[PDB]
């Protein structure tokens with residue numbers, strides 16, 4: 001079974017609620033997207049492996065803990081992904097950024113990957129994939145294909161809202177990934193959008209239509 | 210009945226705290242890590258906030274969301290070092306009311322105070338980088354209780370057992386959140402291993 | 416008319432640009448200076464924005480203030496390096512519409528999401544470097560065809576070959592750069608330049 | 621020589637200052653705009669910094685870059701309002717030493733009451749950027765500058781959002797060698813010494829007190 005973690009922290013639910021206002025501004029919506037993305041990053045990095053090391057402290061040698069392994073890689077799915085990347089980099093600013101571009105065909109609801117440039121030695125790195133919505137799951141399944149195809153074994157997915165249909169498709173497609181969502185909504189409408197959902201999060205964050 | 214202590218053992222909090230122990234660390238990075246670790250302690254101290262269902266107009270019609278109940282939280286930075294963690298705390302609670310407090314170590318007496326209104330109806334997050342003997346923290350809490358506050362949480366980067374014991378005996382209803390419980394104090398009252406003169410390292414004043 | 420060029424010689428811009436030239440600079444530092452310099456160029460390029468007076472209620476009664484006239488400007492980041500300066504430009508113009516463009520080359524864009532009514536908006540095309548000006552010219556062609564008639568280019572460094580190409584193809588755009596380097600090497604990189612800005616900002620190799 | 625005064629007319633500075641004047645503005649956005657307008661005033665005030673050519677190893681060999689000459693600048697925020705602008709100043713000079721100076725105005729006499737000061741060392745070899753949102757009578761700024769000169773500081777720049785003519789005249793008479801950078805020069809002071817149109821009580825708005 002796929003590891004699913006619905007973050008129920010009061011601040012996460014409060015800020016997610018503000019983003020559901022249909023009259024919210026693009027500015028406010030962008031700040032909240034990055035803010036909630038920052039909190040989901042703290043929930044997803046709670047199981048990182050640490051190692052004890054001795055360093056010269058203010059009053060002589062002292063034992064400190066550092067994150068074991070090579071630097072993490074943040075995988076923002078263009079375009080909506082960038083609206084959450086700043087919140088992630090806040091806790092891991094040395095993270096390697098692997099930009100992946102994917103837009104959805106509103107006619108077929110299938111993913112259309114147009115860009116990718118992953119970091120090197122990704123097989124020795126953990127990937128934090130950030131995308132505000134998990135509706136049918138096509139875009140996330142297409143992203144994980146590129147990562148595993150590149151040799152990445154450790155993958156974590158951070159999303160604001162996720163529909164059961166998208167969680168089911170992702171689980172049968174890649175059950176070894178861990179999903180961290182700020183909410184599990186009811187489902188999808190006849191146009192493939194999540195309900196209650198956040199609407200067209202992508203165009204709402206970039207200010208397009 | 211006993212004072213609740215929460216030593217945040219999250220991998221990023223332990224890693225960022227360890228970097229602040231570097232003797233060659235710069236004021237720039239020490240000040241940044243102080244805020245970063247401060248925002249993570251605030252997320253831990255706000256996990257028990259009470260929420261309430263409310264209906265608002267969503268992107269697809271009416272939707273029931275949750276909102277934090279009660280008046281806005283008050284951040285209480287202790288001059289001067291406390292101002293160095295204020296940015297990190299206001300990061301997840303930007304509407305928080307800031308109540309600056311200055312304690313003079315003589316028993317200690319406050320020399321400056323500008324508390325928010327109706328503090329008896331708010332939760333107070335007292336922030337200070339270190340809890341050594343607990344003199345300044347205990348004095349700051351005495352002042353908050355006289356004002357009528359009954360819900361208090363203390364956020365500190367490092368804390369010594371002496372300070373923890375002093376705070377527990379003086380205010381057991383307080384809840385302490387620290388990135389580390391150090392070994393003790395030296396003959397000058399500094400925390401060991403500690404972070405040295407945190408205030409001077411944050412502002413860059415010898 | 417000759418293309419309007421503005422080389423930002425502000426002490427902080429030249430100081431931060433100098434820090435980015437270090438060969439041992441970290442992705443974190445380089446990425447942070449890219450946005451920092453990006454925000455300063457944005458401020459330098461928005462000094463001519465027209466304003467209109469409006470009456471609001473001040474603390475001591477009504478007061479006449481000024482707001483930015485016309486529709487919100489659009490930031491056009493070129494994939495992929497261009498995204499490394501986007502947060503810097505949004506800092507002082509957080510309401511700006513983001514028009515992502517992907518050029519491959521007439522110029523054939525592989526991906527585009529332009530804002531609506533772009534013919535009634537100013538466009539801040541951002542990209543860390545202007546080596547030959549191929550990508551920048553291709554992007555401006557797409558914006559001009561969409562109806563935009565007010566375009567400004569923001570780059571950290573630019574080679575004389577790129578400035579000349581851009582000036583010939585689009586003399587009505589206005590260029591803002593933190594520096595005008597000597598030229599290009601046998602591989603097209605700007606010299607002294609910043610090297611592979613895209614890889615340094617994201618951490619790829 | 622008269623005091624060098626600079627009123628920043630940049631459209632974004634005028635627009636952002638105009639938003640801070642709305643009476644129903646929240647504490648959150650008032651604090652954000654105070655810091656942002658503070659970073660734009662920092663850029664304007666650091667346009668005359670002296671630089672020196674230095675050779676460093678670039679990615680494609682040696683290259684001559686420019687660097688700011690002298691020791692690190694000291695930011696001087698006047699508590700409490702001052703902290704609301706300090707973040708915008710540090711954005712451009714993050715290595716700057718912070719010299720905290722605490723002063724509250726005696727609303728009965730309008731005279732400043734200094735209660736705290738912690739100046740950086742070797743301040744006689746540094747430039748000081750004093751930040752405070754309002755320059756009403758100028759008492760707080762004049763008192764702060766007296767502390768800096770007493771410590772041996774010679775180069776001082778003042779960064780304020782709104783300034784009243786009374787405060788500008790009081791500051792020029794007491795310390796004409798300082799440079800004043802303000803986002804606006806208002807009409808004057810009311811009967812209670814507050815700036816009009818001004819920003820009201822900037823200290824309480826930024827901290828959300830009273």
Ligand SMILES: OC[C@@]1(O)OC[C@@H](O)[C@@H](O)[C@@H]1O
Pocket residue numbers: 005006007008009010043256
């Ligand atoms: O499961 C969601 C969760 O991890 O979110 C953060 C905290 O509220 C936790 O108590 C809670 O269990």
Ligand SMILES: OC[C@@]1(O)OC[C@@H](O)[C@@H](O)[C@@H]1O
Pocket residue numbers: 009042043046219252253256
């Ligand atoms: O990182 C996870 C965790 O330990 O820290 C955040 C809080 O919400 C806790 O409840 C949670 O268990």
Ligand SMILES: OC[C@@]1(O)OC[C@@H](O)[C@@H](O)[C@@H]1O
Pocket residue numbers: 320321322323724
């Ligand atoms: O104005 C009242 C005041 O001066 O009273 C004494 C101290 O508590 C000060 O902080 C406070 O401002």
Ligand SMILES: [Cl-]
Pocket residue numbers: 050051052
């Ligand atoms: Cl170990």
Ligand SMILES: [Cl-]
Pocket residue numbers: 052053054
């Ligand atoms: Cl070891």
Ligand SMILES: [Cl-]
Pocket residue numbers: 068069
């Ligand atoms: Cl290792």
Ligand SMILES: [Cl-]
Pocket residue numbers: 013183184
């Ligand atoms: Cl929910």
Ligand SMILES: [Cl-]
Pocket residue numbers: 325326327328
């Ligand atoms: Cl009260």
Ligand SMILES: [Cl-]
Pocket residue numbers: 388389390
């Ligand atoms: Cl520890």
Ligand SMILES: [Cl-]
Pocket residue numbers: 531532533
């Ligand atoms: Cl159109």
Ligand SMILES: [Cl-]
Pocket residue numbers: 675676677
């Ligand atoms: Cl060198």
